Write a protein that binds this ligand. Sequence first.
Ligand SMILES: Cn1cc(-c2cc(-c3cc(Cl)c(F)c(OCc4ccccc4Cl)c3)c(=O)n(-c3cccnc3)c2)c(=O)[nH]c1=O
Lengths: 301, 303
Amino acid sequence: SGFRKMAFPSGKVEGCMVQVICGTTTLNGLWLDDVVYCPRHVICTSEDMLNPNYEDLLIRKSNHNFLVQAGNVQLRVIGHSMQNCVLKLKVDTANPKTPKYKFVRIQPGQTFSVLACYNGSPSGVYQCAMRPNFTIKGSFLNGSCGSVGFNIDYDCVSFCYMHHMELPTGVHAGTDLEGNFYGPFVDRQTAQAAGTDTTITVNVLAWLYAAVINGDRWFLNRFTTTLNDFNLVAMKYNYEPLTQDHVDILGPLSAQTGIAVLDMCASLKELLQNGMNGRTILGSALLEDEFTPFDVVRQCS
Amino acid sequence: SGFRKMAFPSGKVEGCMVQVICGTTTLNGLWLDDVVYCPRHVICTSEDMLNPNYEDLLIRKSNHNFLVQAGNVQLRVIGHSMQNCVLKLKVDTANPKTPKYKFVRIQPGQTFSVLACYNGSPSGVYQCAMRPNFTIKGSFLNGSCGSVGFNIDYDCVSFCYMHHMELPTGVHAGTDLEGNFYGPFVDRQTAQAAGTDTTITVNVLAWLYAAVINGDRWFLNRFTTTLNDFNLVAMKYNYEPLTQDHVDILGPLSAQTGIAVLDMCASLKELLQNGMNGRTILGSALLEDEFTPFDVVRQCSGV
Ligand SMILES: Cn1cc(-c2cc(-c3cc(Cl)c(F)c(OCc4ccccc4Cl)c3)c(=O)n(-c3cccnc3)c2)c(=O)[nH]c1=O
């Protein structure tokens, strides 16, 4: 048993991380086939960052302005192009360690693993989730731009995130591997603030089901609730509204434990009202919201 | 900024995980050079596990009782021997993906990454600590026996743990890569429980320093305690004693924040008595103790 926040084995992503240098800038790149993906703000000076004209800055760049290093091997850039906020460096060598991969855009509440990298060198891996305000609560230092988030299914690596910036509140914003930002954020040094963050309700419910599966039942009660009555209460605690889609994806966990989804919603309503009272659930003194219903069936059932 | 429970990149270890079958038992092995390491209890049946005579059981076994699958490529076992509780299986081929490595034994309070595997295929990675009662609070399902714990220094993998069994309270027991158990446990189906666990005090203090570094500062105060006054309070809440060596390694965090160690102990003592009751620190409603001072420095300042 036991239930921890497991990240995916990072081996297939480590083999793709490289260092991209342009002028005074050093950040990370993702080497897949003969393409290196990195944030397009690699081409900026600090003065550009307030209102960068990325099209104007890139057209002034030549291939030899970009220094790419994979280990002790320096790759030769033979071309470049921009796709949304991601720069794509064509190189004369395909990465022999290129795994089976594909690019995906995830939705809030979805989880993935982050391979934090510095100077193209992987340093640590951790699991996190896309927040409802489209930020992630990562751990990033200066130099970590270009780090990627991912899931691995069987042997296919689905890249879903590339790290671009840290917001003033210490939270992090980025793009998918097609250069499209998650949320209303831009790669500009102007004033940007994430909206109010909320708890991922469907993930908390899935986590309570995993608690019942592992033998924790102290929080259940004899109550039920309607869907609308639950949302009116939960939204008073800054929880995300639960939808019928969410009710449906919890069915397998409801059928495995014999506890109806709206019955577990009644338990959560009471937990929000009473707190933990010194107790814990799966070793946590608060309600965890970064385990998806999919993740629960994976590590548990 | 930000702080999360961070594991080492597991790639150098993923390339060493193989599957080991003996009869009906299936678990994981560590393939380094031309030797595959795995728990010795793989040779036991359910009736054997009740009171095993390992030297007799292994003597009556053959190289042909060991099926070793590395991905889809079979590995011929050309020899076998026991070192303590770890079975060593000589194979015909050295592992081409063998990293620079060494076997080390860790102490309670030290942390390491665990690559949980199932049928020789890596499934997930997570960071944990060797508890003071020599257990680890891991996440293991059926078939994870043989998963290893490790740290990485530069390019060198320091293997420190191999998973053997789960205890009745849901915690886990295992050995170093030389077969020596962590804690007072034996690899036999018998009645064994873990001792009263305690909180790793030096790790909590380092974690509170990481909180200060990230802007969570409400728990600070102007007061100082003594190492004797603090340890008298710590023993009452099942906290490990704070030694002078623990204060010394918190030194870098003390200088970088301006919070002397015994000031942070005054903050910790007040948190121990007055509780938290839902108020959080680094998004946690309890005191985390699975980050060493070195973990904090590596993650918060990249030193
Ligand atoms: C040259 N250079 C720069 C970086 C790098 C750039 C950034 C970064 C990227 C962009 Cl597009 C920005 F608009 C930006 O201004 C943020 C800001 C400031 C003031 C008001 C509002 C806003 Cl929004 C910052 C970064 O946030 N980080 C980072 C730091 C800590 C944790 N995580 C990410 C790092 C790098 O890694 N390597 C490298 O060579």
